[PDB]
């Protein structure tokens, strides 16, 4: 992060050991379940590109996913270099990624007037690569999520919406999926109950109606 | 490209 | 949260990694037992809508419950947009929910004079959705809570009042329930002891009288 | 609508 | 708690997540053993009524005990309303309990000149209700604490004084109990040793004399 | 009413 | 503890939940092994009598030991009242023990000019009672510590000096014990080796000579 | 009375 | 680390016990897996040579690796003494390594104008020695990483890129390896799928194509 | 430690409960493995003699080692009293050891101009006694460290250099040992490989050459 | 000499 | 007397 010194200078605060250990635990245990991305975004609040790189470098497992993340960051940096032709100096994509910029340049940009928020720009490129990884690490298609003959509709709904969150289709497609597949893939009892509610039923109405099945 | 996993807020 | 900078500016403080980990543990383990809502409310003291969204997004399980929560937040935001027609700018319901507002706008409202407390307004909509989830995740009707033939009256009272807390009827109905069902559903020994105390007996008197049964 | 789970205080 | 802001205003500090987790662990594990009340009193140093309510609301188990606590708090609030007739405004019992007062009113009273210490008044009513709960949850009468034929006198003394602490009779009665029952309920060897010390013996003298039995 | 559990200090 | 406020007033800082939990763990697990007293003294640095009472009240087990501690504190308070006849006001023994003094009086004394250090005086009376408890809870006389036929002399020395620390005789007696018993109670091989070193041998010389036996 | 358990320092 | 005192002096802050315990756990458990070096670099942000030496000295295991690290640090210090002939005084290589410099000299250099960043120079020599150790502790050649007949291509990619990270060849060689070996060492099904993508395929394309095999 | 107060006075900061618990864990678990001394030195940064005594007194086990440490501290204090004849007052050896000095005298010396750093002087005497203890608690002579017929040379090197670190001979003797014994005590395969490298081989060269044996 | 293990940033 | 256990730095 960045902190104001008692002398009034813009100063780096290192990402704490407990914040790094929390991130390492999250990536190691949750293995790109979708909640990894909100947790990354929360653990990297106000992070410089050096802090973001520290988080990504400290991941020991999943090195294929980290290579896909690096490839995404590189094509996002190249796209920035395309969209922002070269003339504080203006940062190149490699400067935003923190490969060709010093920590002092990063803080110089992030505290400029107006700020050039290279930490947030880079964090967008990271999250945009984690999106692809979470989508790929999703173990099932939403079309594969079907309710068991004796499975509670609540457990099926949990599986369905966790899969829908990982697959991360557009909202119009998620709307079609929750309207159509969630009913269609329910077991015959629940499917019978749910059709009786009509197409306008909310998820709370559906889960209430199926709560005893 | 995927829409992201942020159920709440501004993504 | 919000903090005053040494320069006197209103500044964001990120929700700490340990506070997020505490919330994630609470939702994962306690699975919308009613104490989840006081714990949410305590962990989100002074939270901006961005902080509240961070807490809700970091929940990995229970995605059906999180969809019911999102649906509640959306109808509360729509009700705000109905009750507050559009003319610092005034926040829309999507701004209070932190979907169409920046963190800087959120802090601008929360530190205005008078403040527009969009974090507390949004936290009310969240708690109001968690109320519905806790009521739905209640495993039993209060009518189903009956004392076993050899069950201690204290364990039955614990089950009864935990169910009464989750079902969260109005206070007049809770009064009728604790007056009527708690005696009626006691086992025949306790039910005999409790009727002898008359209708005015307090719970401490009831639990004392049944303490040896 | 449910009354909420706050046994103590102002809900 | 309450903290002075850098602007000199009286400001709320939220009870920390680790302090709440400590309290929740204490109530869950120790189940109204008497050390729960000193631990409550230590974890709630400088607490506002909102902080005290947060602690009490976050308890998920023991809902019969929490209802007895609520009933005690209500009769203490009613007694305050009786002893303090209504004319900063003066707080009613429901204001001290934090049901009809805002956090800002609570801080206004707690930092008035002279302060009206509504947090300490309410904490007295809470501790006074926990006293009743600890007395009720005591598993044995002091009359039931008797020494086993081969039990160490130190383990019997530990059981006796833990029961005496939970039963919490008046000090004159505790004096009579430790003078009379502690000797009377010792096993025949220890009872023989202890009578030889005469009635003036201290507990350290008694425990020394019985240390080899 | 019970005397309280504070073995030490002012209760 | 005591802290200076930003307004320059002498202000209480509550003993932290983690410091209390550390103390509770120490007393629960180590059961008046002698290292409990240094750990008490370290955890209660700068403690007011209210903080010291909080530590002692939060101990749930060992209530016979806590009664012996209370009895010691009472006779130390009575001895203070004897040695300091009554004429800021001067504290009585019950004020130093924090039974008849408010926290504000305690801070008033501890920050007076010159200070009356009622926290340190009371902590001396507590440590002086813990000394008696540690001596009583010592499982063996130093005369009972004898080396096994195949026991390492280092393990025997550890047992001997741990017992000598708990029994806490005067230094002249500890000198006689380490000179005489430590050799006398060694097994015949070690006892033969140790006599050859003569009476002036240091413990490091003794442990070196016996290191292969 | 016991001498105390402080092996090091001023007891 | 270094901190500005309230008197304005440049002052040492000790590396915290939890940061040291984190480092000790990392080296003990992860045994020079490549993520040890980013974790070292994160835990030693702003470290003086004394702090860096504290981290290296607190490692209890792996003493052969720590001797190779010492040998690397010594040849880097000798190379500094070669490249910087002797004329605040200028630091020698042994001063940068913190063997012949006091903490006060280290802070004097690190806060000079311009600073001589002996902590960062020494941290480069440490990381440069850890590079050699991580390369040596790599359990397999990249040529030994071959896909099992029923192994998921994602698990093979994880093994391949973790080995490639530890072996840490030049980027041109890593490019040749990921182009050539990753396809060549895939099992016959995956190898057939991967050749059909042509030589330009990204890792995400390769992992997608093989995701069902 | 020592801290500057907001009033500008030199003030004690107590060694934290977590730092004490870390030290107690270190001594209890690692049982004078050589990394105990760097860990002591790190946990006692800026410690007063009272803080150092608190660390040493809180050790409950190993009381024979703590007596050897006390004996070392006493002969170092006596040597100081010999080297510094008595004329702020000048500290005697018992004052540096914190037996005859108050905390206020210790802070008075440690913040004098020039400072008399009694905490660092005493910490040298402690570390000098721990050196003797670590040497004595070393389970093996370096001459006893021999490679097994199928033991990896890396595991033998780890054993050798851990023993060499505990035995802590002079550097010329460590040089002779690593030149001569490390080759001589290798198993016949490794011993054959290592002789082929000639006498100038580094440990990294030796470990590389033996890496496949 | 090895290139180092820092997949991201400036090594 | 032993040389100490500090592999790195000034002992």
Author numbering:
A (entry chain A), C (entry chain A), E (entry chain A), G (entry chain A), I (entry chain A), J (entry chain A): 1 to 87, 96 to 221
B (entry chain B), D (entry chain B), F (entry chain B), H (entry chain B), K (entry chain B), L (entry chain B): 1410 to 1420
Q: Which text from the study accompanies this structure?
A:
pmcThe mature HIV-1 capsid is a conical, fullerene shell that encompasses the viral genome. It is constructed of a lattice of approximately 200 capsid protein (CA) hexamers incorporating CA pentamers at 12 highly curved vertices. The surface of the conical capsid is dense in protein-binding sites that mediate interactions with host machinery necessary for transport of the capsid through the cytoplasm into the nucleus.
To investigate what effect the hexamer–pentamer switch and the tilt switch have on host–protein binding, we next repeated our structural analysis on cores incubated with FG repeat containing peptides Nup153(1407-1429), CPSF6(276-290), and Sec24C(228-242). We determined structures of hexamers from peptide-bound cores to nominal resolutions of 2.6 Å, 3.1 Å, and 3.1 Å and associated pentamers to 3.1 Å, 3.5 Å, and 3.2 Å, respectively. Within all three hexamer reconstructions, we observe unambiguous density for the corresponding peptides, which adopt structures essentially identical to previously reported crystal structures. In contrast, in the average Nup153(1407-1429)-bound capsid, the switch is in the high-tilt conformation with R143 positioned below the helix 8/9 loop, Q176 pointing upward and the shift in the backbone position at E175-Q176. The peptide-bound structures are, in all cases, consistent with the available crystal structures, suggesting that the interaction of P1411 and S1412 in Nup153 with Q176, A177, and R143 in CA stabilizes the high-tilt conformation of the tilt-switch. Inspection of these resulting densities revealed that the Nup153-bound hexamers adopt the high-tilt conformation at all tilt angles, suggesting that Nup153 binding stabilizes the switch in the high-tilt conformation even at low tilt angles. We did however, detect an increase in relative Nup153 peptide density at higher tilt angles, suggesting increased peptide occupancy. We posit that the increase in observed Nup153(1407-1429) occupancy at higher tilts correlates with the arrangement of the R143/Q176 tilt switch in the apo form, because the high-tilt conformation is favorable for Nup153(1407-1429) binding. It would allow Nup153 to preferentially bind to the more curved regions of the core, which are localized toward the ends of the cone.
